[PDB]
Point group: C3
């Protein structure tokens, strides 16, 4: 099994979140994705405090696919500099991890 990782991404709306997930999944760049709607994202954009609706995405993939996934998400995200972060999975259920890998 290749090492697993968790990818965090935020979409500006549910339609966008929906087809960003469908895409990376179709192209086998992620094993599965969880969408958490009704969130808010605060940050400074050009010296101004912005506050916008976001769908928090959580995608499961492996370290060998993370970059491909990242670029695909970036390529289809409507924003120029979308949130794309990778967190390491230091431990997980063997059967689930095997399934994660099999999916890719």
């Amino acid at each position: 099994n290749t090492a697993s990782v968790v990818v965090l991404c935020t979409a500006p709306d549910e339609a966008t979140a929906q087809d960003l997930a469908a895409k990376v999944l179709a192209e086998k760049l992620a094993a599965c994705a969880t969408l958490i709607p009704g969130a808010t994202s605060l940050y400074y954009w050009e010296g101004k405090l912005e506050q916008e609706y976001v769908v928090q995405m959580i995608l499961k993939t492996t370290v060998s696919h993370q970059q491909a996934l990242l670029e695909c998400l970036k390529s289809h995200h409507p924003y120029q500099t979308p949130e794309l972060l990778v967190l390491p999975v230091t431990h997980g259920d063997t059967d689930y991890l095997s399934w994660l890998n099999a999916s890719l």
Copy 2:
């Protein structure tokens, strides 16, 4: 002992609620956050599956992850539920002391 965060996906509220009370009673986790209204997407049989799920986030220590995962797995209705462990590289000393003292 170092802390970790555990991600687990539950089919519904009752299940998420059952797994949490369970692992907390067993003292295999210090706390658990539940976030309903989530959507999990994945391919099965070659088609795109979309299900409503409850995202779980459990806090524990490295020495418990094995036990916690086994507990969550056996009590979980699904066959091979999502069970991932993320490392905590740093945290508030007082909150970490509480986490450890609670297990």
Copy 3:
């Protein structure tokens, strides 16, 4: 300049927003995602408590993690709120550059 995500549990939305808007102004965090509609279960004095909470996910770097936690802790209504730091082992170059450039 390693990046990290910080998890913080806020009791309500107004509090989560004030904490976010504060750490962002102080430039201790580059972005804060607030996820309402959650609950937290834990034992307190032997009793099982379950409370509504807002899950916060803040983005910063290792250099600022300590100061970010100190600031959050101070303005957090709780005595010892959940403050956990998770490592970001990789991310999109443009996002990371933007994140880093947003910090103090």
